[PDB]
Amino acid sequence: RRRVIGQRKILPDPKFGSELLAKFVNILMVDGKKSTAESIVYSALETLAQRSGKSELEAFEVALENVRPTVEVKSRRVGGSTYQVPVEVRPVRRNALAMRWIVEAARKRGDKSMALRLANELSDAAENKGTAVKKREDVHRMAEANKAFA
């Protein structure tokens, strides 16, 4: 526009010490409310803990920062001729976007509870059952093979 517009910073999850975990409650926000959201977060977190005595946090991180978005098509003027310009994506916004997606992917896997979903779902890191693998085959398919420029 003419100003970069954001808003206030949300607080890191205070009983596991982690901002990512708190931004994923927000993703699951139900009735407008964080409360009934945090339950299920924590329920499925434990599911993952049982199968994974080590960090079960690096099966979110790997999966989604393998996926590196880059494509859209715009246009701008250059030397008095406009040209249809392809535009790259900046590495920060790649991150920001990617964290959301996996957790968005739940409530459609046709289970009973968000337990059985987010548990079985999140555990994978590169063999995903979540939207992360399913966007790979479109992002790199497109790019630099049907994209004439950076």
Partner 1 sequence: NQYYGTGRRKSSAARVFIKPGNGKIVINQRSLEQYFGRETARMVVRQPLELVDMVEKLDLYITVKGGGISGQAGAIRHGITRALMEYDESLRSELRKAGFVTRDARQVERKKVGLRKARRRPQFSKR
Partner RNA sequence: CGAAGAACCUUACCUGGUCUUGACAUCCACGGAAGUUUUCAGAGAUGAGAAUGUGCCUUCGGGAACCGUGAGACAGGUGCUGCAUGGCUGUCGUCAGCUCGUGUUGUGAAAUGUUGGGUUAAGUCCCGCAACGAGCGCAACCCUUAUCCUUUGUUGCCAGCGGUCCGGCCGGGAACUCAAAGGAGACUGCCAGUGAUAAACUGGAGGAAGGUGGGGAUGACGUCAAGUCAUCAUGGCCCUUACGACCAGGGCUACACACGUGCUACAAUGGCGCAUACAAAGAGAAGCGACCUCGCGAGAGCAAGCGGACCUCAUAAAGUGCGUCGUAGUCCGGAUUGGAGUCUGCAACUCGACUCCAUGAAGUCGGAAUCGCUAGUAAUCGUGGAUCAGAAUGCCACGGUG
Partner RNA sequence: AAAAAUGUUCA
Residues lying near RNA in the complex (CB under 7 A) are found at 5, 7-8, 28-37, 39-40, 75, 80-84, 106-107, 112-115
Three-state secondary structure call for residue 96? helix
Report the distance separating Cα 65 and Cα 91, nearest Å: 10
CB of 34 to RNA, least distance (A): 4
56 in contact with partner 1 (CB under 8 A)? no
15 in contact with partner 1 (CB under 8 A)? yes
Report the distance separating Cα 109 and Cα 105, nearest Å: 8
Report the distance separating Cα 58 and Cα 29, nearest Å: 23
CB of 58 to RNA, least distance (A): 23
23 in contact with partner 1 (CB under 8 A)? no
Helices (DSSP H) in 35-149: which residue ranges?
A: 35-51, 58-64, 91-104, 114-122, 131-142
| Binder of residue 11, out of RNA, partner 1, none (CB less than 5 to 8 A by kind) | partner 1
Q: Which residues bind partner 1 (CB under 8 A)?
A: 8, 11, 14-15, 34-35, 38
